[PDB]
């Protein structure tokens, strides 16, 4: 959507670049997961409320 939002012709040209979109998605997902992990490490240190 960032590059070829709603454009079939543009999308087909992106396919010539292989995995670049996949890699970008993985990197951002990895960050998102990490951010919840960080919160838990700091605050959820006890299992008793």
């Amino acid at each position: 959507m960032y590059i070829c939002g709603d454009s079939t012709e543009c999308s087909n040209l992106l396919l010539q670049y292989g995995s670049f979109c996949t890699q970008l998605n993985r990197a951002l997902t990895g960050i998102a997961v990490e951010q919840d992990k960080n919160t838990q490490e700091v605050f959820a240190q006890v299992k008793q409320i």
């Binding site: 670049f20 890699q23 990197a27």
Partner: protein, 49 residues
Amino acid sequence: PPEAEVQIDRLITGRLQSLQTYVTQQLIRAAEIRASANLAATKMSECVL
């Protein structure tokens, strides 16, 4: 010859971008593992010795 040079240069650029991407990710990941190694070393000294 000149037709090939255009096509060859296009592949070279694409492949160089792929290597640069790879290396950048490895550098970032290496910093992460180093931080772990430093922690491990700290624990070794403080809790084992």
